[PDB]
Write an enzyme that holds these catalytic residues in place. Structure first.
Site, PDB file in Angstrom:
ATOM      1  N   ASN A  53     104.972  94.218  51.225  1.00  0.00           N
ATOM      2  CA  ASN A  53     106.232  93.703  52.226  1.00  0.00           C
ATOM      3  C   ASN A  53     107.097  94.759  52.491  1.00  0.00           C
ATOM      4  O   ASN A  53     107.342  95.091  53.636  1.00  0.00           O
ATOM      5  CB  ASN A  53     107.158  92.367  51.416  1.00  0.00           C
ATOM      6  N   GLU A  60     109.042  91.010  38.798  1.00  0.00           N
ATOM      7  CA  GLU A  60     110.648  90.545  39.754  1.00  0.00           C
ATOM      8  C   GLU A  60     109.293  89.773  40.545  1.00  0.00           C
ATOM      9  O   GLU A  60     108.452  89.603  41.493  1.00  0.00           O
ATOM     10  CB  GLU A  60     110.794  91.598  40.555  1.00  0.00           C
ATOM     11  N   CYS A  92     110.918  88.594  48.979  1.00  0.00           N
ATOM     12  CA  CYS A  92     111.282  87.622  47.681  1.00  0.00           C
ATOM     13  C   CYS A  92     112.706  86.920  47.806  1.00  0.00           C
ATOM     14  O   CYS A  92     112.480  86.003  47.516  1.00  0.00           O
ATOM     15  CB  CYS A  92     111.204  89.070  46.771  1.00  0.00           C
TER      16      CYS A  92
HETATM   17  N1  LIG Z   1     108.077  90.595  46.257  1.00  0.00           N
HETATM   18  C1  LIG Z   1     107.969  89.179  45.497  1.00  0.00           C
HETATM   19  O1  LIG Z   1     108.398  88.603  45.476  1.00  0.00           O
HETATM   20  C2  LIG Z   1     106.739  88.731  46.678  1.00  0.00           C
HETATM   21  C3  LIG Z   1     105.738  89.894  47.388  1.00  0.00           C
HETATM   22  C4  LIG Z   1     104.466  90.328  47.318  1.00  0.00           C
HETATM   23  C5  LIG Z   1     103.748  88.685  47.747  1.00  0.00           C
HETATM   24  N2  LIG Z   1     104.856  87.647  47.351  1.00  0.00           N
HETATM   25  C6  LIG Z   1     103.861  86.097  47.085  1.00  0.00           C
HETATM   26  O2  LIG Z   1     102.528  86.746  47.122  1.00  0.00           O
HETATM   27  C7  LIG Z   1     102.242  85.929  47.681  1.00  0.00           C
HETATM   28  C8  LIG Z   1     101.097  87.167  48.597  1.00  0.00           C
HETATM   29  O3  LIG Z   1     100.101  87.371  47.740  1.00  0.00           O
HETATM   30  P1  LIG Z   1      98.653  88.724  47.737  1.00  0.00           P
HETATM   31  O4  LIG Z   1      97.332  88.209  47.383  1.00  0.00           O
HETATM   32  O5  LIG Z   1      99.442  89.746  48.630  1.00  0.00           O
HETATM   33  O6  LIG Z   1      99.143  89.533  46.226  1.00  0.00           O
HETATM   34  P2  LIG Z   1     100.465  90.156  45.522  1.00  0.00           P
HETATM   35  O7  LIG Z   1     100.519  89.459  43.896  1.00  0.00           O
HETATM   36  O8  LIG Z   1     101.069  90.262  46.557  1.00  0.00           O
HETATM   37  O9  LIG Z   1      99.736  91.454  45.142  1.00  0.00           O
HETATM   38  C9  LIG Z   1     101.139  92.800  44.638  1.00  0.00           C
HETATM   39  C10 LIG Z   1     100.673  94.079  44.315  1.00  0.00           C
HETATM   40  O10 LIG Z   1      99.717  93.112  42.718  1.00  0.00           O
HETATM   41  C11 LIG Z   1      98.638  93.100  43.096  1.00  0.00           C
HETATM   42  N3  LIG Z   1      97.303  92.654  42.065  1.00  0.00           N
HETATM   43  C12 LIG Z   1      96.762  91.451  43.126  1.00  0.00           C
HETATM   44  N4  LIG Z   1      95.987  90.861  41.886  1.00  0.00           N
HETATM   45  C13 LIG Z   1      96.113  91.718  40.676  1.00  0.00           C
HETATM   46  C14 LIG Z   1      95.653  91.831  39.352  1.00  0.00           C
HETATM   47  N5  LIG Z   1      95.092  90.979  39.028  1.00  0.00           N
HETATM   48  N6  LIG Z   1      96.585  93.088  38.639  1.00  0.00           N
HETATM   49  C15 LIG Z   1      96.747  93.713  39.133  1.00  0.00           C
HETATM   50  N7  LIG Z   1      97.637  93.995  40.477  1.00  0.00           N
HETATM   51  C16 LIG Z   1      97.287  93.027  41.009  1.00  0.00           C
HETATM   52  C17 LIG Z   1      98.416  93.139  44.529  1.00  0.00           C
HETATM   53  O11 LIG Z   1      96.659  94.445  44.491  1.00  0.00           O
HETATM   54  P3  LIG Z   1      95.240  94.118  45.489  1.00  0.00           P
HETATM   55  O12 LIG Z   1      96.273  94.469  46.685  1.00  0.00           O
HETATM   56  O13 LIG Z   1      94.925  95.210  45.301  1.00  0.00           O
HETATM   57  O14 LIG Z   1      94.518  93.090  45.065  1.00  0.00           O
HETATM   58  C18 LIG Z   1      99.367  94.066  45.191  1.00  0.00           C
HETATM   59  O15 LIG Z   1      99.222  95.531  45.256  1.00  0.00           O
HETATM   60  C19 LIG Z   1     102.675  85.750  49.485  1.00  0.00           C
HETATM   61  O16 LIG Z   1     103.200  83.782  49.456  1.00  0.00           O
HETATM   62  C20 LIG Z   1     104.115  86.030  49.066  1.00  0.00           C
HETATM   63  O17 LIG Z   1     105.561  84.597  48.744  1.00  0.00           O
HETATM   64  C21 LIG Z   1     105.945  88.215  46.521  1.00  0.00           C
END
Ligand SMILES: NC(=O)c1ccc[n+]([C@@H]2O[C@H](COP(=O)([O-])OP(=O)(O)OC[C@H]3O[C@@H](n4cnc5c(N)ncnc54)[C@H](OP(=O)(O)O)[C@@H]3O)[C@@H](O)[C@H]2O)c1
Ligand SMILES: NC(=O)c1ccc[n+]([C@@H]2O[C@H](COP(=O)([O-])OP(=O)(O)OC[C@H]3O[C@@H](n4cnc5c(N)ncnc54)[C@H](OP(=O)(O)O)[C@@H]3O)[C@@H](O)[C@H]2O)c1
Lengths: 486, 485
Positions: free
Chosen positions: A153, A254, A288
Site C-alpha cells: 500500500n 502494525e 490501514c
Molecule cells: N498496513 C496495513 O495494515 C496493511 C498493509 C497491507 C495489507 N493489509 C491487509 O492484508 C491483506 C493483504 O495481504 P497480502 O497477501 O498482501 O500480505 P501482507 O501481510 O500485506 O504482506 C506484507 C509483507 O509481508 C510479507 N509476508 C507475507 N507472508 C510472510 C511471512 N510468512 N513471513 C514474512 N513476511 C511475509 C509480504 O511479502 P510477500 O509478498 O513476498 O509474501 C509483504 O512484503 C489485505 O486484506 C489488507 O487489508 C494491511
C-alpha cells in the site's frame, strides 16, 4: 539521470543478482505493462545480507552523530532532486494515484528529515546508587541489525519510517519489501541512501516471496528487532516466530486495524461527509487508517448517507498519472478478487446497497453500503479497497459500542460540534489513535504511531522512534571492595 | 496476629476455594512437611477473575494518584509489620536460606515503595502540529488488566516487581504463581494488598497446574499485557501465544540467562572469588542473574580455581532457617533430577571435576567443573542450581568471545583493576546489564532490568515500569476546519 539497473539488489555490500534462480516480474497494476524483472534472493543471500550488516554496523555506530546525520540530510536533498522520478515510480509500481504518490513522497521526505536530528538527541543516563562506591550508568546504543518488512500500500513511506530512524541511530538494516512493490520497497531507497553516502553493507534488500523466505527473515539469529506492517494473519505468524522461535527478538507490529468513523448527531454534516469521502477514498481505500465503517447517530444517518453517496458518485475513477484522479486501480488480481467477494457477501448478508460503481479491469469503482450491522463481514473485517459500510446508531452509547466492536483498533475518528463531547468519546475508544473533527488517516513525525488490541505492538516516530531503535545497557562500576555476607 | 486461611484464593472479589476439583499440597522442600493445601482453580475461575478485574479496573484508575499511592504506602507498612512472617513464609515454601529470604524481603519492599511515587509521575504530552487549527494530544493511560506469571525461585519479589507498578498505575492484575510456591507467589501479596486497602477484585490469584490453565491464562482476551519470568522453553510458548494467538497482547519476558562472570588478568583475586562465591551460591544458584559461566584469563585461571574451590568447601549446606546456612534445599525433586543429570553429563562432556559435593535428600552441595569449553552443555545452558563451570581464556579477546557465545544474555560481570578497560569490555557484552568488579546478581529499583537475545523481552523498574504498564493514546483535536484535496 534517472536510476537504471534497478533489478540488481543490494546484497552484503554490493549490487548483484540474487541466486534463487527464480525471477520476479514487477508490473503496472493499471495496464499490466511489465516494468522490470528481478533475479530473486536466496536463503544464502539473506544470511550474507545479515552477516555483512553485522560486520559493518559497529563502524557505522562509531561514527560521530553529525556524520550519520549528514547522510540523512543528503537523503533529503536527493528526495527533492528526484521528486518526479520518485513519485512516478510510486504511481507505476503500486498503482497509486498521482495525488497519493505526492502525499507518500512528502511523508517519506518528512520522516527522513525528522530522523536526521536523532543522532544529536539520543542520550544515556547516570543514576545514583545506594551501594557505597557503586556508580550506576546506562548507555543508549543502537540495537544492531534491524530487519524491516514492507507492505505494498505505502511501500516507500512505510519502509522509510523504520530504516531512516534506525540508520540515523547507528543500526544497520535489511529490508524485505512486498513482492508487488520491491522498487518502492527500498530497492530505490537503497539507491537514494547510496547517493546520500551511506557506507556499503549497512542497507541490504532481499527480494523474494514472504511465503518462502519470510520465516528465515524473522527467524534469523542476527537481527535484534524486526518491524512489520501488513496483514494480521501474517503479522501473527511473524510474532509467533520472533517471540516463540529459536532466536528471540523484539517485534514492532502494525497490523491493519478497522478504523471506525463516528458521526454523532450534533456533527457538522458537511465536514463529516467531506472527511468521510477523503478519509475513505484516498488511495482507493488501501490504507490501514482508511475508515472501514461509518457509524452515524440515527437522527442524522439519512442526511449523511445521502450527501455521502452524492459525492462518492463524483469521484473520478481512471488513470493514476492524472492529478485529478481520485480512485486508481487495485494493486493486483487476487486483491481485486477479494473485494469483489466482499461486495457479493454484503448483498448475501442483507446490507442495502446505496451505490454500485462498476469494475473496469483493475479499476474498481466505489461501492457504498448502508443499513449495516456489526456482525456483517463488511463491518468486521479490514477492507483494503473502495468498499465502505454505513452503520446506523441510536444512542451515542450505541455509537461507542459499535465503534469498539472491532478486534483491532489502530486509528479512529469521531465527529461532533461539542469538542469536549468528542474528546470524552475518543478517550473511550480502544484504539491507539483518534482524530476529532478530522480524518483518521494521519501520521505526523513527532507523534506516536501504533495500534492497540489485534493491530499493534509498539510505537513509531519522534522520541518513540529513538526508544524503539536503540537499547539500554545498565553498566554499574564498583569503585571500592563490596562486602559480601559469604 | 499472623495470616490464617491462606489456602483460600482471591477470585473475582471473593476469597474462595478453586473449582478444579484437584487439591494441591504445598510442602517444605527441606523436610517434606506440609505447609497447606489448596483447592486448585479451573478455567471458569480464571474467566471470572479476568472479567471482574476488567469490571472494577476503571473505578480504580478513575481515582486520583494520591489514593492509589496511599495503598502502596500502607502496603509498605504491612511489609515492616509482618516482616518476620513474610521471611518465614519464603524460607518454608521455597526452600530459601534465611539470608536470601531477607534479601528478597528487602527487594520486594523497595519495589513497593518505589512504585508509590509512580502515580504522580505519569503524564501525557501536548505536541505541535503543522496542520492549521489542529491540537495534538497524547494521553498516557493504564493498560487495563495485566496478567502476571511468577517463577518459584524468587516468587515474592518477582511477582511484586510487576504487581506493584501495575496496580499503582491504575491497572488490575491477575497472578498465576508457580505451583511449588503459590503462597509467596501472590497469595501472601494479595493479603498484604487487601490489608493495605486495595479494592476487591483488582487483585486475583489463580492457582492451577501450568499445563492445565497456562495456555488459557495467556490466550484470554481480557489482559492487555502479560509478564513472565522463568525458563526459556515456557517463555517461548507464552510468547508464541501472546504474539501469535487469536487475541494479541503485549508481553514482557524475563527468561533465564547464562550469565558470564569474566575475570581478566589484572583483577583483584580476593574480590572476584568472593563475588563468584556469593554471586553463584546465593539461593543455591536458583537465580536468573546467577553465574553460569566463570571465564578467567589463562594467566589467572589456575589461581582463581584453587581459591574458588577452597572457598566453596567452606559453605555449609543445611537447614535454611538458620542464619549461617548458605546452601539450602532444591525446590522440588524434578528440579533436582535435572541438575543431577547435568552433573553427570558434564563428566561425559569431559569437564574436569574440581569439587563434588554430596546430595542428601533435597539438599545438593556445590559442584564445580573446570577446563570447560563453550560447546559443553554446562556452559551452553543455564542451570538453576549450585553448579558452575570454569572456562579458560587465552587473552581478553578470547574471553569476550566466550562471554558473548551464549544464546541468552540477561546479566554479566567483569573484573579488572583498570576501570576503563573493564567498561570498554562491558559495552561489548551482549547483555542488558553488566556489573564491573561486582556480582551479576543486582537489582535496583531505579535501574533498568531486562535481558537481551533469548533472555528477555521488555524492561522493568523506574521510568521503564511507567512505560511498561501504561499505554499512550494519540488524540488530535481540530479547532478549525482542515481542507481535503
Ligand atoms: N498496513 C496495513 O495494515 C496493511 C498493509 C497491507 C495489507 N493489509 C491487509 O492484508 C491483506 C493483504 O495481504 P497480502 O497477501 O498482501 O500480505 P501482507 O501481510 O500485506 O504482506 C506484507 C509483507 O509481508 C510479507 N509476508 C507475507 N507472508 C510472510 C511471512 N510468512 N513471513 C514474512 N513476511 C511475509 C509480504 O511479502 P510477500 O509478498 O513476498 O509474501 C509483504 O512484503 C489485505 O486484506 C489488507 O487489508 C494491511
Ligand atoms: N523456572 C525458572 O525460573 C527457570 C529459569 C532458568 C532455568 N530454568 C530451568 O528450567 C527448569 C525448571 O523450569 P520449570 O518448568 O520448573 O519453571 P516454569 O514452568 O518455567 O515456571 C514459570 C511459570 O510458568 C508456568 N507455566 C508452565 N507452563 C505454562 C504455560 N503453558 N503457560 C503459562 N504458564 C505456564 C509455571 O506454572 P506451574 O508451576 O504451575 O507449572 C510457573 O509458574 C530447570 O531445568 C531449570 O534449570 C528455570
Amino acid at each position: 539521470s534517472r536510476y537504471t539497473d534497478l533489478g540488481l539488489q543490494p546484497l552484503a555490500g554490493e549490487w548483484r543478482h540474487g541466486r534463487a534462480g527464480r525471477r520476479l516480474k514487477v508490473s503496472n497494476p493499471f495496464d499490466g505493462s511489465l516494468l522490470l524483472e528481478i533475479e530473486q534472493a536466496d536463503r544464502d543471500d539473506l544470511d550474507a545480507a545479515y552477516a555483512k550488516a553485522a560486520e559493518v554496523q559497529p563502524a557505522w555506530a562509531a561514527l560521530g552523530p553529525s556524520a550519520r546525520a549528514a547522510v540523512l540530510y543528503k537523503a533529503v536533498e536527493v528526495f527533492d532532486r528526484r521528486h518526479e522520478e520518485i513519485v512516478d515510480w510510486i504511481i507505476r509500481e503500486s498503482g497509486s494515484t498521482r495525488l497519493k504518490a505526492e502525499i507518500e513522497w512528502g511523508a517519506a521526505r518528512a520522516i527522513t528529515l525528522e530522523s536526521a536530528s536523532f543522532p544529536a538527541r539520543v542520550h544515556g543516563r547516570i543514576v545514583e546508587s545506594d551501594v557505597p562506591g557503586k556508580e550506576s550508568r546506562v548507555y543508549r546504543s543502537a540495537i544492531g541489525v534491524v530487519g524491516v518488512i514492507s507492505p505494498w500500500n505505502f511501500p516507500l513511506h512505510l519502509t522509510q519510517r523504520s530504516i531512516a530512524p534506525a540508520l540515523a541511530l547507528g543500526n544497520a538494516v535489511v529490508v524485505k519489501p512486498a513482492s508487488d512493490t520491491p522498487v518502492c520497497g527500498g530497492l530505490l531507497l537503497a539507491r537514494i541512501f547510496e547517493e546520500a553516502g551511506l557506507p556499503a553493507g549497512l542497507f541490504s534488500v532481499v527480494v523474494g516471496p514472504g511465503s518462502e523466505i519470510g520465516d528465515a527473515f524473522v527467524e534469523h539469529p542476527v537481527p535484534g528487532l524486526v518491524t512489520f506492517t501488513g496483514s494480521t494473519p501474517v503479522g501473527r505468524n511473524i510474532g509467533r516466530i520472533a517471540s516463540g522461535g529459536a532466536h528471540l527478538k523484539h517485534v514492532a507490529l502494525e497490523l491493519g486495524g478497522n478504523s471506525p468513523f463516528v458521526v454523532l448527531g450534533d456533527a457538522d454534516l458537511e465536514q463529516a461527509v467531506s472527511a468521510a469521502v477523503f478519509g475513505k477514498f484516498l488511495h482507493q481505500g488501501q490504507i490501514c487508517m482508511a475508515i472501514n465503517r461509518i457509524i452515524v447517530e440515527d437522527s442524522l444517518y439519512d442526511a449523511f448517507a445521502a450527501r455521502f453517496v452524492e459525492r462518492v458518485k463524483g469521484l473520478r475513477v481512471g488513470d493514476p498519472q492524472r492529478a485529478d484522479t481520485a480512485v486508481g486501480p487495485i494493486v493486483n488480481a487476487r486483491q481485486l478478487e477479494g473485494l469483489l467477494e466482499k461486495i457479493r457477501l454484503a448483498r448475501q448478508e442483507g446490507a442495502k446497497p446505496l451505490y454500485e460503481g462498476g469494475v473496469d479491469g483493475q479499476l474498481l469503482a466505489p461501492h457504498v453500503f448502508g443499513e449495516v450491522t456489526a456482525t456483517m463481514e463488511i463491518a468486521r473485517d479490514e477492507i483494503f479497497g473502495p468498499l465502505v459500510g454505513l452503520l446506523r446508531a441510536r444512542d451515542e452509547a450505541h455509537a461507542l459500542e459499535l465503534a469498539n466492536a472491532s478486534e483491532y483498533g489502530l486509528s479512529s475518528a469521531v465527529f461532533s460540534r461539542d469538542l469536549e463531547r468528542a474528546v470524552r468519546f475518543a478517550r473511550q475508544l480502544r484504539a491507539g489513535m483518534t482524530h476529532v473533527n478530522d480524518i483518521p488517516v494521519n501520521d505526523e513525525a513527532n507523534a506516536p504511531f501504533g495500534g492497540e488490541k489485534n493491530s499493534g505492538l509498539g510505537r513509531f516516530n519522534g522520541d518513540w522512534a529513538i526508544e524503539e531503535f536503540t537499547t539500554d545497557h545498565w553498566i554499574s562500576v564498583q569503585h571500592a571492595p563490596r562486602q559480601y555476607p559469604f
